[PDB]
Design a protein around this ligand. Structure first.
Ligand SMILES: [Mg+2]
Lengths: 129, 107, 54, 60, 257
């Protein structure tokens, strides 16, 4: 009834994975859905941005208090106040009012009141790093 | 491999060939299609009705008569509509509107 | 008129469209309710669009 | 002699290597023999004392 | 980075310093006193459960995982692939249905794949076939789908491999028609459907059999076989890296359903 077998290659493709790797190279940039690799070498701007574990540009929304929409860049590093001034400057033509923003210096983050999300991702993308 | 008791070798007993998976009117080279979000949009397809060799001469005359409003100043018949914008829903009822116009001009 | 525009005026003749205003299109809700299938297809365009991604 | 223990995982280019001296307890008066490095994620992240107090609570 | 050296400007960060972050917990006011408390808190759906649920897989996110490398196209695109890299997750519970394709925006999508979902749009079928995909729709029964989706644990469960049962009667006519590009229909009726869709999609249906991965595309999954590469009734001896399969005749017969 029993029989030892060695065809576990089918077993191997059945093994789901954990340690997510960096993406394979899509030749054109942006990708088909528009993903991007970070540009190399990184720019010489004292504002510094890391990417995601799942490798995207680190921008996120924020919802609270019923009408409270805001947004934040999470893993900021360096002299973050420069990034705040730059975000206000980009936002300056965007809504006119001065940017209602706060950094999280211990947490190394920047947050701007209001959802200016996709354009902010564009600004970080045009920064390239 | 393994074959089920209700396997496709019996569940489709006649067709044992692979090619019957996908084996096989409106021309593809002649017409031009356009989609652009204008939120709002308007998706259109245009083709030279004078150069329409795929239409019969009475059918071409009926198209040039009934769709004279669709006939442009350059003699190009164009058709634009409004549902949603991508591959399968936006281009080919533009194509099928052209085809139904041809069918109505036939009779 | 076109001859005078091309020769005498030495300029391209303009053409006017005489276009009417478009439909307002009704308000889009979460569910079509009792309406027919035309409720979910109003405010974009047209004829061949498709699903998530090839 | 020398020894250069770099980090196995490729640390990203957005920081340099995180290097220090490499020691041993063998020499009773002979330390500072060799020098190596580690990734910024190993010993050179943000200061973040608040995370440490979180670690303190989850410990105690 | 002035942070580490600025910290070096103090004594050794001993246990006497680990302060809770200001804003950790609001003050635990004992409900009393001259300010806070003087009286202390008193003063002086019929078939929702029988409704099926199917996880909608965003095929734009399928394109993302194609681009992001979560699911490579070099092998078949199965629920094993659909879960294994964590691009979109399934929930066996709540009386669910399974994985089914989504319906928005196939612009800028250049890849070759072989999708096997429970359900999809006709637009989704044309979306797959536009670059030349493969679309099939069997069922995935409750215990069967639960075994299938998280294949790690049942590979070490110890019972022998179950076989997927056929769909119920309501789900039977869905799989019975090739117009859905399914699994349980006539394998020749699919060709006229592909031609009619290519007409309806305005699509140039390429001869995918001429393509390089046509044999890779030729894999259309057998019914009652959750594992794409393994044998019904088998046992994954994950320690010795072996496959324990029965040989008994009545056992083979009940296994060969
Ligand atoms: Mg929020």
């Amino acid at each position: 009834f029993v029989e030892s077998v060695d065809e576990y290659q089918f077993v191997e493709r059945l093994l789901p994975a954990t340690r997510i790797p960096d993406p394979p190279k899509h030749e054109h940039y942006p990708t088909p859905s528009g993903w991007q690799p970070p540009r190399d070498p990184p720019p010489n701007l004292p504002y510094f941005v890391r990417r995601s574990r799942m490798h995207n540009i680190p921008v996120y929304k924020d919802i609270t208090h019923g009408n409270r929409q805001m947004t934040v860049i999470r893993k900021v590093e360096g002299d973050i106040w420069a990034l705040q001034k730059d975000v206000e400057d980009f936002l300056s033509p965007l809504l006119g009012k001065t940017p209602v923003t706060q950094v999280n210096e211990v947490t190394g983050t920047l947050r701007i009141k209001g959802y200016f999300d996709q354009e902010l991702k564009a600004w970080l993308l045009e920064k390239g790093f | 491999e393994f074959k089920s008791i209700y396997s496709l070798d019996k569940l489709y007993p006649e067709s044992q060939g692979s090619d019957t998976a996908w084996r096989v009117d409106i021309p593809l080279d002649r017409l031009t299609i356009s989609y652009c979000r204008s939120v709002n949009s308007k998706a259109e397809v245009r083709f030279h009705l004078a150069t329409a060799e795929w239409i019969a001469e009475p059918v071409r005359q009926k198209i040039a008569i009934t769709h004279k409003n669709k006939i442009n100043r350059l003699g190009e018949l164009i058709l634009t509509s409004e549902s949603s914008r991508y591959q399968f829903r936006n281009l080919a009822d533009c194509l099928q509107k052209i085809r139904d116009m041809i069918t109505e001009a036939s009779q | 008129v076109t001859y005078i525009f091309h020769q005498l005026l030495d300029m391209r003749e303009p053409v006017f469209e005489f276009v009417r205003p478009p439909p307002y299109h009704p308000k889009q809700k979460r569910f079509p309710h009792r309406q027919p299938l035309r409720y979910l297809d109003r405010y974009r365009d047209s004829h061949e669009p498709t699903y998530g991604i090839y | 002699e020398p020894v250069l223990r770099k980090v196995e995982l490729p640390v990203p280019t957005h920081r340099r290597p995180v290097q220090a001296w490499v020691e041993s307890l063998r020499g009773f008066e002979q330390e500072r023999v060799g020098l190596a490095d580690l990734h910024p994620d190993v010993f050179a992240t943000a200061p973040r004392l608040d995370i440490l107090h979180q670690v303190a609570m989850w410990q105690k | 980075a002035r942070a580490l050296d600025l910290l070096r400007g103090l004594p050794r960060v001993s246990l006497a310093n680990l302060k809770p972050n200001p804003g950790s917990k609001k003050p635990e006011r004992r409900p009393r006193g001259r300010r806070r408390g003087r009286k202390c808190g008193r003063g002086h759906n019929e078939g929702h459960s029988f409704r099926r649920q199917y996880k909608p897989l965003s095929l734009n996110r399928l394109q993302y995982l194609i681009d992001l490398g979560r699911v490579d196209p070099s092998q078949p695109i199965d629920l094993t692939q659909l879960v294994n890299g964590r691009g979109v997750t399934i929930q066996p519970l709540k009386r669910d249905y399974g994985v089914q394709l989504v319906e928005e925006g196939a612009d800028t999508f250049t890849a070759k794949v072989n999708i096997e979902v429970q359900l999809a749009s006709e637009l989704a079928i044309a979306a797959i076939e536009k670059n030349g995909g493969v679309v099939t729709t069997a069922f995935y029964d409750p215990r069967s789908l639960d075994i299938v989706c998280k294949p790690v644990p049942f590979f070490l469960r110890g019972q022998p491999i179950p076989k997927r049962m056929l769909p119920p009667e309501e789900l039977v006519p869905y799989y019975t028609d090739a117009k859905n590009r399914g699994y349980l229909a006539d394998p020749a009726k699919f060709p006229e459907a592909r031609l009619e869709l290519a007409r309806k999609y305005g699509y140039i249906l390429p001869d995918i059999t001429k393509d390089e991965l046509f044999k890779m595309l030729c894999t259309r999954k057998d019914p009652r076989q959750i594992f794409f590469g393994l044998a019904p009734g088998w046992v994954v001896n994950m320690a010795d890296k072996k496959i324990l399969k029965p040989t008994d005749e009545n056992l083979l017969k009940y296994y060969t359903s």
